[PDB]
């Protein structure tokens, strides 16, 4: 629980995730 | 009931096999620029299977980083005949009666003087830099531009990559400039930071100009001057409609079908390059603990550096098959979120009247502006003028990332190696150049810098391929048919 | 295949040094063959057992054959063009020297063979010819002159 | 040279039977239907003849 | 895990209806002549 | 539009050539001639169509659609 | 020198 | 999934194998 | 795991048959001398 390893960075974590189009605010840019 | 129609002869027996195809390269560039890794040309009805392992190692960090690296691949396939009109041509396709008599060939870059230099586009398509007087076929060149208007261009605050259909030669070039250069080799194109509060702001409340109700200006006591009839009304509020949903969903061919009618236009239809796969993944940091003894003027026994090594693996990057010539180019880019530490939150500057306040009548409203306040506060008469515009009460859905205290960058004594923040010597404008990433903010993390021409990133990419194509297992020479 | 052990910094950075957290490597590898040899003689004879180690190689001077096609539709491959005879590689692929010499021919391959290859590479910083160059991170051919097909 | 010359005459002859448009070009050559849309052709919707 | 990315709107919601068009034409022309006989936008 | 289904479709690539098509955003003006090419687009007389495919009609104007083959012979003499 | 002299087909 | 050994160093991975007499391209070399 | 190594072409396909060779051949010699009485190529 509280050990962990030499991996820890950063408060927030980000996940993998495959890419898809997409049309956000103001049109398409990647 | 029946006659004689003539019909195809089905043609010749077309061969086809299977082949492996492994591919390696090793790299190095920055954070930020779209880097091609790799590209093939593709013969009609080929099935392209592709598989990608990559290797990621960036500079060795001062501190563990309390912000995160980010790596985005991409692939994507592009027809000979939408970078160059005169494929059709050069496969015998005629205007005039039987066969063409004068077919160009395929267009040529020229190497600029002295050769293209490191770290251009040139030198990761595989052209050997500082080799003068070497011209080479320019269709992948080309091809890069396109995929940069069709995909990564923000068409808000910026124009297209000069991009030629013509026949005629070109010349290499060894510039940075993001427009004219990018077809000519030079230095890469830099990808557009994350969509978030502020890099999502939009020049205009609509994209047009923002729609009024006449006024006339006669005089003969005025007499006549007519007025405004509720026909002319419900004109002028369709056309407010019309360009704040322009706005919002950009203009683009592909976009305005989508916004307008709610149709999905495939992108061959329309010319585009099409868009295969692609996969996102932040890097890991391995923090390391300093096991030497404390010296003087130095840092003391237990002190964490931290070195990154990252292993990711893309299974799928490509799988379709091809009907026509074409090229796969696949790329990767090197982002990161962004934290905001010269601006105050649109809140704190709430309360004239009751009107500024939040109040669900006013959710419909128009786009708002948002103040250079917002972005970086200076303390004078630009803090009340506009930055950009977002959507009405945006602030309450977002709160942008920040730093507080010694963690800052203006600081004397600064710890801001500990992240990626941005820091502005003058008043940021929603631009192009603002709205690009910037590899200076992760640089000033890293033990050996960029300024100190060290790459940011070292990389090894191992492609394997499946090519289902329609060549014979063996090219054995000697003819079937005479 | 070796094995490759990378080792951390952890002494402190000091001026004109390796920072604290640089890796470097080492290389420990066991190897076990058995059955290495499994027969009966019916002669007077020697056995001798050989070693050599080797790596697989990558290209950083030359440009793919690609990138010369297009002079006419011929030069494109077609499943017509498909059992022709042995085709030339030009020195402008293994190496290329802006020069007469790089339409000159390397060698023979099979018809159409660069379709179904694509050699190992090298970009940017890594490559030898840069003055600051990282190719100490790879084992890439590096050529003062023009390379000729020999022994 | 005689092999050479033996598959540009196969090339013409197969131009010849079945038409060089690029539409045309992609069957013959490489077995492969590619559609009209995406050629910029026109799109053939239906038909009848009596 | 989840950050904030902007994403569509999707935009207003469109009207949809089916419509019965009915038209007829009379026509006169000779043998071999290609001749249009209908037009619509879509 | 007319034009351009008769270059994708009607028209026989051998022995004549397309219809003219203009692309650009320029006025065009008009015309009443016959012209099977350069009146199509100009809204004239109506394109006629190509006879059935039949023995004569499938005709093709060389056997090979190029520059008949042939096998190099040099002139030199000393 | 011999001009002309043509050649041999491939039909 | 993400944590691994200090025997990290390349993308490619060469797998082990018995030698067998071949012959390719060229004749036999080893 | 897998890379391309080169290997054989297994080459062309060799045809193969049948043939039945009748030989005939009459000899006169003494006896104790060795006689060749067949040969051929293989």
Redesign the interface.
Known sequence: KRHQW???????S?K??????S???????? | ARV???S??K??H??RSK???????????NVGEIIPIYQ??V???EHIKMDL???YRPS???V?????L?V?T?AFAVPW?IVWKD??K???????????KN?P??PDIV?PSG?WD??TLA??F?????????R??SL?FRAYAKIIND??????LSSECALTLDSSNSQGSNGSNQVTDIQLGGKPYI??K???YFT?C?PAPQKGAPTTLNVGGMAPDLSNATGISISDLRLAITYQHYKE?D??????Y??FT??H??VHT?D??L?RSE?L??????L?????????ST?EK??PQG?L???S?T?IQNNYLVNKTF???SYIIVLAVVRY?HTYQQGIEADWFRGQDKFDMYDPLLANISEQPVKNREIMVQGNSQDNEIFGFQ?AWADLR?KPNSVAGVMRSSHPQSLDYWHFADHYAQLPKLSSEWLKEDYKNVDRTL??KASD?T?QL?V?????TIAE????L?????????
Do not use: C
Request: charged share 20%.
């Open positions: 030499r991996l820890t960075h950063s408060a927030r980000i993998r995730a495959n890419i898809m189009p049309n956000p605010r103001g049109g398409r840019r990647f | 004689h129609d003539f195809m002869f043609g010749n077309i061969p082949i492996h195809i492994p591919h390696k390269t090793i790299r190095a560039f093939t040309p013969y009609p009805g392992t990559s290797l060795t960090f001062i563990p980083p309390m912000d995160d980010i985005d991409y005949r494929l059709e050069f496969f015998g396709e005629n205007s005039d009666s039987w066969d063409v077919a060939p395929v190497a050769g490191y770290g030198d990761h595989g052209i050997t830099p500082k080799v003068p007087g070497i080479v076929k992948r995909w990564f261009r923000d068409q808000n990808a557009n994350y969509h978030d999502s939009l949903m706005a919002r969903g950009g203009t683009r592909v976009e989508l916004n009618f709610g495939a061959a239809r010319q868009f796969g692609g996969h996102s993944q932040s890991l940091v391995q923090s390391v603990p300093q096991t030497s010296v130095m840092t002190n550096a931290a070195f090594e292993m009907t026509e010539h979120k959507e977002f033990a050996l021409n790459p070292r090894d990419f191992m492609f394997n194509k329609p060549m014979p063996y090219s054995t020479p000697g003819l079937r048919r005479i």
